Amino acid sequence: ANPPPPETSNPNKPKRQTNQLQYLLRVVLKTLWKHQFAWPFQQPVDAVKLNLPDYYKIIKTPMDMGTIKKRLENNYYWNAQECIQDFNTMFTNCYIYNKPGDDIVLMAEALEKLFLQKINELPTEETEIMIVQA
Numbered sequence: 001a002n003p004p005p006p007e008t009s010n011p012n013k014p015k016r017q018t019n020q021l022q023y024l025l026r027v028v029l030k031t032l033w034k035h036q037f038a039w040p041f042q043q044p045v046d047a048v049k050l051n052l053p054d055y056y057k058i059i060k061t062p063m064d065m066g067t068i069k070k071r072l073e074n075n076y077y078w079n080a081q082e083c084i085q086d087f088n089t090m091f092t093n094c095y096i097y098n099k100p101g102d103d104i105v106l107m108a109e110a111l112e113k114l115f116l117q118k119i120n121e122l123p124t125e126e127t128e129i130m131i132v133q134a
């Protein structure tokens with residue numbers, strides 16, 4: 001039985017926009033979304049359909065790019081590092097649940113490599129922005 005998907009907004013969680021969060025949404029995630037290995041990670045894991053026994057016992061924090069995209073669009077994060085942590089949770093979940101060299105691990109590893117390449121391009125200093133008419 002799959003849990004509800006992770007929250008993508010929180011009216012009591014402090015929210016903010018920065019140049020780096022902005023770059024994460026409109027450059028990094030856009031580039032990842034079209035990668036040949038994006039498809040397994042564009043929505044939450046459905047452990048029932050995929051036949052992943054004990055997935056939600058082993059994986060305490062399910063995460064996916066569909067959720068990260070909504071979180072970015074809803075200005076859910078305080079800073080870029082918080083968003084980067086969700087990406088890292090997504091990749092490491094895969095490494096935890098599966099075995100090294102498994103096909104899904106290889107795909108996650110390649111996607112992660114591209115992710116790390118793109119976040120190397122982030123603006124050097126993180127500064128707040130406020131795009132009002134967004």
Ligand SMILES: O=c1cc(N2CCOCC2)oc2c(-c3ccc4c(c3)OCCO4)csc12
Nearest residue numbers: 039040041045046050052093094097098104
């Ligand atoms: O940790 C994971 C383990 C595995 N598997 C699947 C079957 O072989 C055994 C292990 O799958 C995933 C996926 C995934 C894979 C395929 C998809 C998918 C999602 O969503 C859309 C349709 O195709 C994402 S994380 C993950």
